[model samples]
Target: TEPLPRIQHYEDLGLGLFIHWGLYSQMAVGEWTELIHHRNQHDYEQLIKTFTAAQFDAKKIAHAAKAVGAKYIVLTTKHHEGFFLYDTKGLSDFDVMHAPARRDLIAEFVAACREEDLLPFFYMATYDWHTPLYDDDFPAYLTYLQKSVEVLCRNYGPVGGFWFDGNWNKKDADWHLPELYGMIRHYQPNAIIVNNTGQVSDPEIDVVTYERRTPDEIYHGAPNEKYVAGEISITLNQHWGIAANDLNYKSPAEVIETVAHARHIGANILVNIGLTGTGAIPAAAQTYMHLLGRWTAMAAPVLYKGRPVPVTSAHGTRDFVLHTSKHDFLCILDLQVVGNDNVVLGGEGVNPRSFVGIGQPIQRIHWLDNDEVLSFTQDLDKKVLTVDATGYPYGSDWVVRIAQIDYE
Candidate 1:
C-alpha cells in the first residue's frame, strides 16, 4: 500500500520535541511515581488541587521548540496517571478544568503551535492507572478509551497525529483498534497514527517507533505494502518526567551524533525533555536544546533533505556520506577540540581521506561550517576521491563536522 501525502510530509520533518509533563512532575520523580511508589489513590488525586500551572506558557514552549529546530511537538495530554491536561467536558472531573489551572491546556498548546508554524501532536497513554474501569471492566475500559480519543479528534481542530503508548502492557487484550482508528479517520483523514510498539509493525500504524534506540537501516516496507516511516524517541536523562536528583544527562556530542545517525538512517528524531512541576522546561534542558538549535540551524539543508548514500571513508571509520540533489556531505565524527598553539591533540592531522563511489567528477570541496576550500584529488575512471581531512581550528570542535562536495 502506498503512503498518504501527509505521511510523506511527516518523513521530511527530521526533528520533533516530545514533552512529558503531568501530575508526576510535581513529585520531582519519574512519570511512574504513582505506580512505582504505590501511593494512595486519594492522596495522589489530591495533588491536582495544588496543580496551578502558572508557568505553563504554551506560547513560550512553542517558541522554544521552534528555536530548537523541531518541526512538531508531542505533548503528554494524558499520561498513565489518567489526569487529563484538557477539559474532559463532563466525561469525568479529573482534568485541568477542575484544577487551579482552569484552562484548556491542549487548546492553548494547539493554538501556540499554529502561531509558531509547528505541528502539534498529542501523546495519549492506553494503560490507565487512575480509572477503575480498566481493572473492574475491561470491555467498558475500551469504550472509555474510544470516547477519550473521540474528544481529542473532535475538539482539536487539526493535529499532526496521535501518539499512543502502553499497548505493550496488555499484548493479549482487545484494544478495539479498528473502531478507534476508524473514528480517527472519520474525523481527521490525513492524520498519522503512531503507536509506540517498538520494532512491531502494525498495518494500521503509519509510523514505526524506536524508543531510546536508532535502527541500523531504514525500513523499506514489504512488496506493495503501506509505507511505514520510522522515528527514534530519546531523552536527555534517564527518566521521562521531572527528576530533580537524576542529573545524568547526555553530552552535547552524544546528542548531536544521535541526530546525525537518525537522519542518516532516514528516521526522524524526537528529543524528549521533562517539564517541571509548574510545567516549565528545566534550565539544563533549555541550555542543551539551545546548543542543538545552533547545530541544526547550521546544517539545515543536509539535515532535512539528505539521504544515505554508499560512500565510505578509507581512513575514518565513523565517516559517512549524506547525499542531496545538489551536493554530498561527508560527516566527520568524533572530531577533537583544538588545543593551544593551534595543535589538535589526538585528531586526524592532515590525513588523506580516501573514499570510493563518487559517480561524477567533483567540482569543489569545502567545509560546511566555514567556507574554507579543501584540496582534493579525484579519478573518474576508478571512481575514487581523496580529500585533506585536517584537524579543527583553534578553539573549535563540532563533534560532527560536515564537508560539502560539489559535483561537476
Candidate 2:
C-alpha cells in the first residue's frame, strides 16, 4: 500500500500538540494512577463525580495550540483508565456524559480545532483497567473498542487521524486492526491511522511513532515499501497527565532543538502537555509552549516545507541544510556569540562556515531571523559554499538559526 494523500499532508504540518486529560486529571497524579498506585477501582470511579471540567476551555486550548504553531491537536479521547471524554451513547455509563461535567469534551474539542483551522486527532487506548470485559471476555473487549472508535469516527465531522496505544499490553491477543482500520477508512477515507509500536516500526500502519526518541537518519521506508510518515511524541516531564510535583520539564532550548531535529528528518514532532485537574494548561507548560511558539513563528516556512538534503559543515558541527522549491535553508546549530562594542569578549570574530554538496548557484544569502545580509563565496564547480558566519549578536540566541539561500 502506498502513502495516503492525507498522510503526506500530515507531514507538512510539522508540529502538533498532544493533550492528555481525563478523570485521572482529577487525581493530579499521573494517567496511570489506577495501575501504578493500585487504587481501588470503586474508589477511582468516584473521581468522575467530581470531574467538573469547569476550566476546560476548548477554544482557549485550541488557540494556545495555534499560537504554538501546531497545525494539529491530538486529545486523549479515551486513555488506559477506560474513561471516555465523549458521550458513549449508552455504550457505557463510564463517560463524560455521566459525570458532573456532563459535557461532550470531544465534541467541543473538535469544534474548537475546526474553528482554528487545526486538524483534530483522537488518542484512543486499547488497554483497559476499569472495564472487566478486558480481562473477563477478551473478544467482548475488542468489540467495545471497535464501537468506541466508531463513535469517534462517525460523530466528529472529520478528524486528522487516530493515534492508538496500549496494544502493546496485549501483544499476543488479536487486535483486529484491519477491522478497526477498515471502519476508520469507511467513515474517514483520508484519516491517517497510527499505532504506537514504541521504538519499532509496524509496516501495516500509515505512520510510525517514536515515543520520546528522534530518528537519527531520514526515514524513506524500506525498499518498495509503502510510504510511512514518522512522528516523535514526547512529554515535557515524566508524566503525561498533570503531576503537581513532576517539575523536571524540558527547557525551551531543549524543546526547540527537538522540534528542529525532528523536522530535519521530515518527521512531525508532537509535544505533550498534561492539563490540570481543573482542565487548565499548567503554568509551566504554558510558558514553555509560548517560548516554542516564538521560535516556530520565524522558522515555520522552512520547518514545514523544506526537506533535508545531504549537506554538511566544514567545521563538522550539527549544521545542516533544508531544501524547498523556492530556496535552500542553512540551519546553523551550535552558534557562537560575537560581542558588540558594549561588551568585551575574547575570540569574537567572523568565522567562515563552509558547507559541502549545496549544488545550486546561490544569488543571495541572509539570516532569516534578522534579514542580515551574509557575505558568502560559492564554488559551483567544487560544490562548496562558504558563508561568513559572524555568530549571533551578543544578547540573542535562537538555539537554531536559519539562513535563506536564494539561487539565481
Candidate 3:
C-alpha cells in the first residue's frame, strides 16, 4: 500500500537530524536559558552582541548530518525565546542579520542541504516570549508569526516541512492554526505541515510530532479519532538545547534501539543536537552520530523498504522485528552484560538463510564481526529457529536478516 500523499517524503525520510542552536548555546544551559534561570530579560537580550558564530559552516553542518545517515535536517528557525536565525524580511531586527553572525544562516543551510541531497525542515516556535504584543495583542503576534513563516517558506527554496511547537503555552487561546497552515501550503505546495500540540492527530495536521514517546504510546494518548503519520522528537542529551555541563548523552546502542523501536511502531525518529556557541556539533553527540551511521549502514536492508512489527520472542525479550513478503529481520539486543549466544525465535515458516535474497538456507550463518557464518539448527514442525551465536561479537546489539524461500 502507498503512504499518505502529503507524507510520502517523510515516510521515506526515516532518520533525521534536529539542530537546536541559538543564544542559549552561549549561556550553555540549553532551551530558554535566559528564561529558565532568574536572569534579567534586558541583560539577556544584549547577548545578541556576543552571538558571533565564527565557526558556523553550513557545508560542514550538512556534511556532518549526511555522514550520520540523516536524510533530512530540521533547524530551529525560531525558538520560544523569539530569536530568529534567518533574515526576517523587515519583520524584526532581533535576528541573525543584525547579530555578529550577520549572515542569512537559514539560506546558507538550505543550499548546503541541497548540495548534500538532504531535505530541509524548519522548527518554528508557536509562542513568542520577547514580543511585547504577544500577551497584550495575541492576534498581532499571530500575524507576525505568519509573516515570519512566509519569509522562511518563500525565500528558502523548497523546504520539506515545518515543525511547529509551543502551542501549549496558550492552550485555550485561538491559535488560528488553519490560517497558519494555509500560509505554508500557499507558499510550498508539496511541503508537509505539522503542529506539535501533543495531540496525536488532527485533520489539519499533515504529521504529528510526539515528544519522547513511542508510536503505540502515542496511540493510547491520542485525542483524535484517526491517526496521522508520526515522528518522534528526542534529545541526544538530557537537555534539548546545548548544555556545556550535560554529559548524560544517549549511547550509540540506545540510539540504535530507539531507531529499531521507531520502526517497530511505524514512526520516524529525529535525534536532536545542540550546537555550541561557535556553531559546532558537540564532540559527544558527534560520536553517537557516527556510530549510528555505521550501524545504519550495516542494517540498512531491514531498516529501509520494509514494514516493522513487534518482535516475537520465543525465549526472551527481543529489541526489534521487521518483515516483508520475502524477508524477516530480527535484532539481537544485549541489554545485559553476559549476552546470550543461543537465540531462539518463535515464528511460522522459519528458515535460516545466509541473508534475504540468497534463497539458500544458509549453508552457513554469517557472523558480522568475522567471516565465520557460525552454525544453526531449526525445528521445522515447531517452526522455531535456534542460532549458535556462541561467539557473537557486537557489544550491545545487532540485526540479522532471515527468510524462507522455496527453491527448485
> For residues 1-408, what per-residue lDDT tens digits would candidate 1 score against the true structure?
666788878877889999999999999989999999999999998989989998999998998889989999999999999999998788879999999999999999999999998889999999999899999998998888888888989998998889999888888777888888888999988788998863343566888886445546677588677788888877998999989999798897789889988887878889999999889988989998999998888788788888788776675467778888899988877566545556537654566777888878888998888888888898888777888876677667777888899887
- Residues 1-408, candidate 2, lDDT per residue (tens digit)? 555678779888899999999888988888999989989899998888999999999999999899999999999999999999999998999999998899999999999999999999999999888789999998899999999999999898988889999988977777887787888888988887888864233434788876445546556566576788888877898899988888787778989988888877778989999998778997898898889998999898798888777787786677778888899998887777777666745326776788999877889999988899999998888899999866777777889999999898
How good is model 1 by TM-score? 0.95
Give the C-alpha miss distance for residue 46 in model 2, angstroms: 0.8
State which candidate, 1 or 3, has the greater TM-score: 1
Candidate 2: where are CA atoms >4 Å away? 199-204, 211-215, 345-347
For each candidate, the alpha-carbon lDDT, in order, equals: 0.86, 0.86, 0.72
Ordered from best to worst TM-score, the candidate numbers read 2, 1, 3
- For all predictions, the C-alpha RMSD in Å is 1.9, 1.9, 5.5
The number of clashing residue pairs in model 2 is 0
Local distance difference test, candidate 2: 0.86
TM-score for each model:
0.95, 0.95, 0.84
lDDT of 1 at 301: 71
Q: Candidates 1 and 3: which is better by lDDT?
A: 1
